[PDB]
Amino acid sequence: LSNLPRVKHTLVPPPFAHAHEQVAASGPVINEFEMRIIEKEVQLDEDAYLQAMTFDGSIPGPLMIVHEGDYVELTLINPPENTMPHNIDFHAATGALGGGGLTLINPGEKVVLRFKATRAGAFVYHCAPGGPMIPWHVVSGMAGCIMVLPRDGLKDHEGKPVRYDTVYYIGESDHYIPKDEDGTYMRFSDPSEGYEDMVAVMDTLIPSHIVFNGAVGALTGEGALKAKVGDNVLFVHSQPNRDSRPALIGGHGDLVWETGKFHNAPERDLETWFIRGGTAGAALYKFLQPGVYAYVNHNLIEAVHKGATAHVLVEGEWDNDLMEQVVAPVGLTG
Amino acid sequence: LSNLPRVKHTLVPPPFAHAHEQVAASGPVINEFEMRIIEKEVQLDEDAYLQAMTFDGSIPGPLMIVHEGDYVELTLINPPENTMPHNIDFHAATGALGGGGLTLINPGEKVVLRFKATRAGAFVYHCAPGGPMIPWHVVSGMAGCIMVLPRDGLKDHEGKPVRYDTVYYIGESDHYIPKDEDGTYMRFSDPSEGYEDMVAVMDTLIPSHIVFNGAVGALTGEGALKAKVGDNVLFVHSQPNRDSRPALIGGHGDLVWETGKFHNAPERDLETWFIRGGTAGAALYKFLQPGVYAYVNHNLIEAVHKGATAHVLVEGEWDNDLMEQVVAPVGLTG
Amino acid sequence: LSNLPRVKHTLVPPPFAHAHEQVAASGPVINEFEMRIIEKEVQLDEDAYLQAMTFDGSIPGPLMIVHEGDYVELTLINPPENTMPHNIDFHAATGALGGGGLTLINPGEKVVLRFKATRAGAFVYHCAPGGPMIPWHVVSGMAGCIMVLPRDGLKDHEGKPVRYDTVYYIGESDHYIPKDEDGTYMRFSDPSEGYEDMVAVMDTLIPSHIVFNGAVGALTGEGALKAKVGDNVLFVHSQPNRDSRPALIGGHGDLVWETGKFHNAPERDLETWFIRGGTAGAALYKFLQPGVYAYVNHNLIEAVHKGATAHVLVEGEWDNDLMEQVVAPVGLTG
Ligand SMILES: [Cu+2]
Ligand SMILES: [Cu+2]
Ligand SMILES: [Cu+2]
Ligand SMILES: [Cu+2]
Ligand SMILES: [Cu+2]
Ligand SMILES: [Cu+2]
Ligand SMILES: [Mg+2]
Ligand SMILES: [Mg+2]
Ligand SMILES: [Mg+2]
Ligand SMILES: [Mg+2]
Ligand SMILES: [Mg+2]
Ligand SMILES: [Mg+2]
Ligand SMILES: [Mg+2]
Ligand SMILES: [Mg+2]
Ligand SMILES: [Mg+2]
């Protein structure tokens, strides 16, 4: 491997993706990444907080992008200020529980894992210390995604090359914040203190919150995603613990790999697709109309009550051939 | 832009400059920079403190160096420990108030701005959140410089190539620390607390301190700059809010671009030049004599009472043809 | 030097080594390294603590690897939270006390030193502020190693090329923790407070602890080093202040440069070698048998009572030709 090129990557926070090339500009390389585990309380919504544990300080953890055949070398750091052991499980990797069996680090320790990205597709990576700690760390926010692109870029159902202009990584996460009898949420001093109460909520399998980018409304309003008519946007969607059903209200999924593995034929013209808990999928869409769109988990209760809604603001010219208000809302009243 | 090379730069603290090449060793590239905003109290002088806000923990912010035609991608980070929103305005950029309208980040947020460095010259970059916050953040220390070199290096008034051996970035900053009736300076717990009192001083337009590298005497004594006879030193001087009149006591400005834009003809043999508030200029000088030099803002009150003085210690052999003490101080007394 | 390639390195914690090539893949380059000085109390053993001062948060400081003829540019950072001045002395460098006279930085300061690695070999680098501070900072943990490989890789006593599969940097450090009359160890709030008491122990020249990787048992048990039969492992051993006598129990030193300078002929088949205090040496060994090995300072009291013991777990097939239990422990008793 000493004869292989090495590339150091600088991760960017979700929903954005670090600089990369869709078509590998060279042969296999060793991709170097680094992440610092950060334990901190985060505001999921008004009067709703989570004693979170995160990869690099964000929920979801940052998106890593490499090419099939490349190697991935991740330096994982657990700062001394943290309270618990952590590790990492790459669904894109082969062996040792995705790397989990070789990356258990206590506060104050670091580890470097190398694995060969032998299979193309978007994959989930997440913490999994062992036993009950596995689901707890994940629902506390410790999960992200790594996208392994085919060396010759994405291909459609006919083998034709497809390209995107922008990648938006939508990391959906389900959380189980304990509630008082009146429905209000509980707050704790640290992750450990709220464990017992959180387990009770987890056992009901009913999330208190289901969010994109770690908080209700994170990608709405001023945080709304941007695009222009004509843009081919690849929406990579991950859900490490629970199913989701992504939909771009106002648009469609032109090409969709709901199971997220690129060598499989993608489906076309979907209104809503399905992301299995414990996986990442991808949908490509070319914007044809300007305006506001709503990217959601299409169980509308989960989208609106739980928080699984993002907004996309698209600039450009309107096309009346596709849609037109023939008769505007009108009528007498009293 | 995916076909353009990417170069990751590691910034060094002022008055020094990160490694670079005067003549572009290749075609246009995308220059990647990262800075962390740091809010902290700094000692401007004995018994004089400033609740500062800085780019990367220094005043001035670090110097960025790229070439005309290149792109600049800056990752700006506002850590959660900070108290206020911040952003960045690049005078070298075109649009959105220099980037200010696209980089407003609250504590705990990050942003990445890309702009094309279409014009050669030294430019100021500074924070400008909006309204009254603009001058306040700047005089609190949030300003630096980015130098955009012509792809074929610097040229003189005749178009002849000129080269420097060393670059010293002198960031001059004016501060307005509140005073008690006896002239002593006030101290506060954080930036916000001292705002009202600082505004009163700002309104007088009289700085309490005018310093190089963020403190009185920062570049004097043990912090004195070093050089050798024969060295061609480029003194890049910035002042984001108030005029300055740089002068190298003991020397001159061999070639000077006081308005700081390299495609303009530089002036020669200056004794003192002028840096307009809100700009950066550059002066090149070849040392001919060893000894101590004083680089100052030539309003001597501002240089000595306010703090605008730096020292340069030059090693080498003395040249009697240029200057000689014919008769040493002598005389009877009583 | 502007015409020389620049390579940015990411250091990894000891006993591991950052990615590198044994044979220089190109002509001379400028190697860029960065380290943050961290002052923190560390647990040397059960009920034994050290108010440590470290390079990059580890003891020993991380291993730097470059090639003879290259230049080394180290950015040293002394964060504002630290309490004392620090600097760095590279035994691999020429002039200014190894760089110590040009790198004295107070808390809140940074410095960048460049030196030419003109001589091949493993060298110690350590803090040396001046006077009594020199030994104190070193025995507080401020020492590491830089390995300068010949451009054409390592060579044996006959000039034949030798290669290793893995490098393990064993940084041995002697500490002098004050003891109560009953033998128990004292604890302090910061380095300065325990200085006077530590000096008394230092004067006896008897270390309370002698450890690998900064703590008793750091590289034993779960921290045991790993290897496979057939692996050529290079054990680089440093001791900045006191002599050590490394030995690989169960194996040997196939090729050993105990004085650590690669152009000198290495010795073969050693059972134990010698590392002079203030130096780094290197020993290469090819594992022939699977099982547990003990890498130790062969003054067994220092190895077992003081802490100088590391374990190596080797996987592979056993070779009865080399060793076999002909008659297992047997006999009548009562
Ligand atoms: Cu975890
Ligand atoms: Cu719908
Ligand atoms: Cu600001
Ligand atoms: Cu004058
Ligand atoms: Cu030190
Ligand atoms: Cu023995
Ligand atoms: Mg990072
Ligand atoms: Mg309540
Ligand atoms: Mg289509
Ligand atoms: Mg930085
Ligand atoms: Mg007073
Ligand atoms: Mg001239
Ligand atoms: Mg580091
Ligand atoms: Mg005791
Ligand atoms: Mg042999």
From Swiss-Prot, chains A, B, C:
Gene3D superfamilies: Cupredoxins - blue copper proteins. It is an enzyme of class 1 (oxidoreductase). Its cofactor is Cu(2+); Cu(+); FAD. It comes from the Bacteria. GO terms for biological process: denitrification pathway; nitrate assimilation. Its main location: periplasm. Binds 1 Cu(2+) ion. The Cu(2+) ion is held by residues from each of 2 monomers of the trimer. Nitrite is bound to the Cu(2+) ion site. Pseudoazurin is the physiological electron donor for the Cu-NIR in vitro. Binds 1 Cu(+) ion. The Cu(+) ion is bound within a single monomer. Cu cation 2 binds at residues 91, 126, 298. Keywords: Copper, FAD, Flavoprotein, Metal-binding, Nitrate assimilation, Oxidoreductase, Periplasm, Repeat, Signal. Cu cation 1 binds at residues 86, 127, 137, 142. GO terms for cellular component: periplasmic space. It catalyses: nitric oxide + Fe(III)-[cytochrome c] + H2O = Fe(II)-[cytochrome c] + nitrite + 2 H(+). The keyword Oxidoreductase applies. Its EC number is 1.7.2.1. Pathway: Nitrogen metabolism; nitrate reduction (denitrification); dinitrogen from nitrate: step 2/4. The type I copper site in NIR plays a crucial role for electron transfer from pseudoazurin to the type II copper site of NIR, which comprises the catalytic center of NIR for the reduction of nitrite. This is Copper-containing nitrite reductase. It comes from Cereibacter sphaeroides (strain ATCC 17025 / ATH 2.4.3) (Rhodobacter sphaeroides). The gene is nirK.
